[PDB]
């Protein structure tokens, strides 16, 4: 269950800006952070974890200052490094607490889709394929030791402390099981004597699922799974397919294995 703090900073020009954040614990979104709000919105009844209201106000202040500072920094770097707008900046920081002592952390920042730099040990280190101006910005960024120190204890101390808290308060919600409903259909036939068999599976929590076409006990090699697409409710949807000749359609079935299915897999024949 890793914590991923996502940041999306849009800079249309020298005036217009919009930096929005959001946080995920595992597959569930725990926090929301809109450019309009001065507060970090908690989406789950346990999003504050074990942190007291005072601790939570202190962290809230850090992000408030971070947001303001980061924006004036990108703007100052645009002028200094002579970079043209629009600019798209994303920051992906966080950690994962391992059972039952260790915990690794990360802080990656990307520019115009591709990675540019990340915090490594005590300082900002650039990616190998980063543009030569990133090296020039690291020179400025690393000079400020106060931020290099503030990021360092927040990732090594506060992130794991927070994760441990969220895991304790949200345990039940993170361990919840929602049974999926599955049904079959006839896909668009790409051949005159060929039919694409389709297996629909939706409403399953958590995300990990195994949906594969079967003859009997024997697996189907040509099983083409889809993307595990999300629902409005924190559930998911999958659509596994298999292209076979009209005569081979008889006897074929599709097995579905899910943590909610208490051993009893959904076996739907054609």
């Amino acid at each position, epitope marked *: 269950f890793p914590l991923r703090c996502l940041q999306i900073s849009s800079f249309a020009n020298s005036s217009w800006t919009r930096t929005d954040g959001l946080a995920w614990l595992g597959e569930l979104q725990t926090h929301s952070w809109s450019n309009d709000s001065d507060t970090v919105r908690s989406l789950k009844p346990w999003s504050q974890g074990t942190f007291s209201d005072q*601790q939570w*106000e*202190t962290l809230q202040h850090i992000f408030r200052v971070y947001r303001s500072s980061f924006t004036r920094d990108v703007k100052e770097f645009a002028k200094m490094l002579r970079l043209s707008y629009p600019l798209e900046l994303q920051v992906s920081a966080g950690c994962e607490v391992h059972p039952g002592n260790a915990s690794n952390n990360f802080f990656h920042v990307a520019f115009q889709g591709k990675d540019i730099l990340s915090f490594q040990g005590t300082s900002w280190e650039p990616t190998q394929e980063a543009p030569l101006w990133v090296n020039l910005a690291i020179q400025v960024l690393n000079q400020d030791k106060w931020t290099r*120190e*503030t990021v360092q204890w927040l990732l090594n*101390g506060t992130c794991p*402390q927070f994760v441990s808290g969220l895991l304790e308060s949200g345990k039940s919600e993170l361990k919840k099981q929602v049974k999926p409903k599955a049904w079959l259909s006839r896909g668009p036939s790409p051949g005159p004597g060929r039919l694409l068999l389709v297996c629909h599976v939706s409403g399953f929590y958590p995300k990990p699922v195994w949906v594969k076409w079967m003859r009997g006990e024997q697996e189907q090699q040509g099983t083409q799974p889809g993307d595990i697409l999300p629902n409005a409710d924190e559930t998911w949807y999958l659509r596994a397919t298999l292209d076979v000749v009209a005569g081979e359609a008889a006897g074929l079935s599709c097995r579905v294995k899910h943590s909610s299915l208490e051993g009893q897999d959904i076996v739907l024949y054609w």
Partner: T-cell receptor
Amino acid sequence: EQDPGPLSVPEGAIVSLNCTYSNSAFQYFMWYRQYSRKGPELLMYTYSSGNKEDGRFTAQVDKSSKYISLFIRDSQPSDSATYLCAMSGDLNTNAGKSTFGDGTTLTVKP
Amino acid sequence: GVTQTPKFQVLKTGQSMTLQCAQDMNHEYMSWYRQDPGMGLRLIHYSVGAGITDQGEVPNGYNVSRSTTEDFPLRLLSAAPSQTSVYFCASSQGPFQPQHFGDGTRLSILE
């Protein structure tokens, strides 16, 4: 996280005033001076492990040994005052806000 | 800097007293400390921003308000000889940055 009682040092001698914060995880460390009938006045502020010079004042920090210190080289009788230390950064001690030590009174004989 | 009002005050027991505090530095955080021989600096109340106040170490007998982000007045409802002290106002940019202290206020509560 505190410091001890009274000290009397003669003129032009190196004064060692220290604070210990075991067991807490502070990140930013302050030093203050307070004269009789006056308010506290910030001497030095340091966030990184090691020493920082500012005239006759050296502020040494050890995040590993969890102890900080202030050294006054060739101390003048002007320095006779109370020396208060405060520490921040520990999200578990006063949710990050600074924690003040009791204070050390110093008298520099002319 | 920080300028607290008044510098000195002599009052009788069970009498209301609001000692004012100003800050022009545009600091978010503001605090009230009291200093007695032995115990040193004890936090009474603190404000992290406008319209937000919380208890300190010794918050009993005192009231605080943060209507604006410049003024943080300390109020004593029924002043007692237990509150005969030296009061300090302190403002800070953030919870980790160093504080800027006022010149202090001496309070004399007489029966």
